[PDB]
Amino acid sequence: INEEERREFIKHINSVLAGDPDVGSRVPINTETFEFFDQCKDGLILSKLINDSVPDTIDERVLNKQRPLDNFKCIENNNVVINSAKAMGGISITNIGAGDILEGREHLILGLVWQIIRRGLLGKITLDQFLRLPPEKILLRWFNYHLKAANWPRTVSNFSKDVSDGENYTVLLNQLAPELCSRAPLQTTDVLQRAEQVLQNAEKLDCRKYLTPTAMVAGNPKLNLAFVAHLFNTHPGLEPAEGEREARVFTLWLNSLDVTPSIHDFFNNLRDGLILLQAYDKITPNTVNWKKVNKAPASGDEMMRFKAVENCNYAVDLGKNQGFSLVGIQGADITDGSRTLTLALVWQMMRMNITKTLHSTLSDSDMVAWANSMAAKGGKGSQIRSFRDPSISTGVFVLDVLHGIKSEYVDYNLVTDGSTEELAIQNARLAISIARKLGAVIFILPEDIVAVRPRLVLHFIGSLMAV
Template structure:
């Protein structure tokens, strides 16, 4: 049986290296040992991971608790590890990655120690997905903690990273009156869906004709704004236009991590006020506390002349909250 392989482009390599450099930027052990920063324009990444140490630290970052770094064999008396010891380290790291849920069925220790680029990209993207799932999971946990403190019910089925991703993009698409919807997590890697969601999150940075432009123009503007707001510089406009599924999904995950926020404690008064002010048949939950219909019902009941429904549909959450405060006060 032949192994499946993952072909890759220089842009994929650059995207992963930028992700790795960012993820381990505060890891003093790795930095002081000279493993990072890695130059994304070279093939340094394939040699840097050969001994397993960099891979082990990245695994620990992407999936906290998945690996015990103290179990890695270390050089003694100034002598470097021999090939057998290096192989044992790599085997241990790969086992920990598999145990953490990463799909590495075609990757063996020799692929890492020999720097087989065509095999390693499957491993790289598994790490990237796990790392972004971790960041989303941290947001989910903070949200869960806040909701429990507030006594607000939540649906566990809606709290998985994949469901959060889908809901995030589908909501953004709806806010821009787009009919495009993701029916599975893989479908969020779509330029039109990304464009609608980006425009809904940063309305002041996009013209009204943005979504009617050609794909090259949309992608160029998206990347331009992404850099302005501090998103990781790992994907290019060309990647989005060419619909590179791996890189487009990478960008989609980074968007979700960047934009998803957890309400501050001061938002409790908004929740309480809305529960009292909104119609009885409108269920107030964490998920819809500042969504269109809920907010519009509140304002329409208390001060219908202050705001239009179109504003509620397109304004960012912060502006909605500010307007709500004006209505309340």
């Protein structure tokens, strides 16, 4: 484990949890000991970090809040941590399970800590495509935009070697605020001293965060990325519906299957058929004969059209073989980026997976019937006609379903009548966090239930049938 990463990460956690009512009794965590990992065992600190990175991910009222907490309660809390992390996007957590957190696995925990911190670095918001790129691909263009403006011959393509001598940072800071930061550090020969001078120039903008002189010279990818992220949030230095949701949900799902170039633009990243073909293999090993597949051009250019169409025609047939309903869809439709048909094909893949995993002939009506049976076990809302039923908007039905699965998890004193959009979203957010506490893998947001997006509601119910 890296000494600085541990120290700095804990420091960041200390300031974020500062005076938190629930974990306040331990906030000031030592930056030089195991202390931290033991403090992470009951999932509270991690759950808090998750909500700081992406606000409202976890309805904290589902967490057990006693600081010696028995293993059983720590596992429930850790289920919420693990399953929330899986749905935030940009995070990869396969090597870590609720039990790993309970045991204080240092590498796994610190690994998850970094993923959570990294996911929160930029915060909120073709430009629409640009803003969905990972942190590194938004900051590099930015960093370079300035170095180019500063007429500096150097360019940045990473946050390790390219920033490790302190020169690019010095020019960047001087370009961002000519009045407080000069290019004088460029004249310092000792690189370690230059790094310190650069960070002192950072304090003038209140941006001396995460990075240390030694971490800079060492080219630590994480600490340097975080440093640049914060500088970007405070000193940009720049002079002045249902379809989209399904796309984002499907993107999280497919990425969860670990397809190579993670997806950041659903309506363009599946055109050469490679992502879809990988998914088929991840779901059913040995399904794809890769000797018949056209590979992405090493040159970086777009695959030739006829080659992408062949790849997509193959993807569609593998779907037909598996029982998918794709009668009106063709390879070329996917290659040309058909919104409706690309969503339809991925949906069939997600839908069939639900049927098969729940088998290890499940109709939509069968799922609605299962959901109603569960909800009728002391529920407060109403039975539903189908996953398209408007009543689902209040978010009460989903809480009733959960109440049927585990009555103890649903305290109706915490359930509103969802008479307003805000109250409905709170019911939905509570339902999602409760489902995660049960171990459910959910890729939707509260708004998908409140707006009653049928396919997304079915995905949620299907995840519950599998806990």
